[PDB]
Amino acid sequence: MTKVIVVNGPNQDLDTLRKLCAEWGKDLGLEVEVRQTDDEAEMVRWMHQAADEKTPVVMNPAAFTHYSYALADAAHMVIDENLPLMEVHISNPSARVATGTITGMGFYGYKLALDAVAHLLSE
């Protein structure tokens, strides 16, 4: 049972997402924890922790649209450990630092990100 962390940036839904992610993870042999923070420094700490603990990461940067140099470095650190780092965006962008990206599938994008993590771990 591989531990995987789903981390969300700024901008209720967390409980709903936790339930869905726990269930999706269980079906994939993953133990999934979901967290959320408005503090980029905390997100950076969580990334460093993931690298230490060897836990794949699913990240929805949300309101962190501008990766600080620190967050970009932390993301590179996770990738450099050969850990999957899946980036999820719930909505599509309008015309008006990751292993792979999933955009526009609502919360189902997290399910696909977990599938991707399980696939990369089985290689």
Add this chain to the structure above:
Amino acid sequence: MTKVIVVNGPNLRQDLDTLRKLCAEWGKDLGLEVEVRQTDDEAEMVRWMHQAADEKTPVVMNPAAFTHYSYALADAAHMVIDENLPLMEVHISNPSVISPVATGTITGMGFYGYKLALDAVAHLLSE
């Protein structure tokens, strides 16, 4: 089995054959009948998208080496999504006004990105 078409641009035989087999099998497991096509001509991709709109077929598109799009392609894409048909966009690797207004986009997962796109389509068909 719901028919789904996977359309690819130029410069993604062995690789396309592998992709085709994988899509066929992934589709089968999800109750989808999946056909995979490739073209170097954007006008042919437009014709395929028109056919998809006509036949009500979900589309998975990898524009591949097509870096810019014609208005005809953008229009064909709008017609597909306006019929509530998914137009999933897949990029093998990680990376506009004229755009295919994709329903959703998957990047960086190599061929596995297509499996994820198919899963997304099948999920919409679930009760």
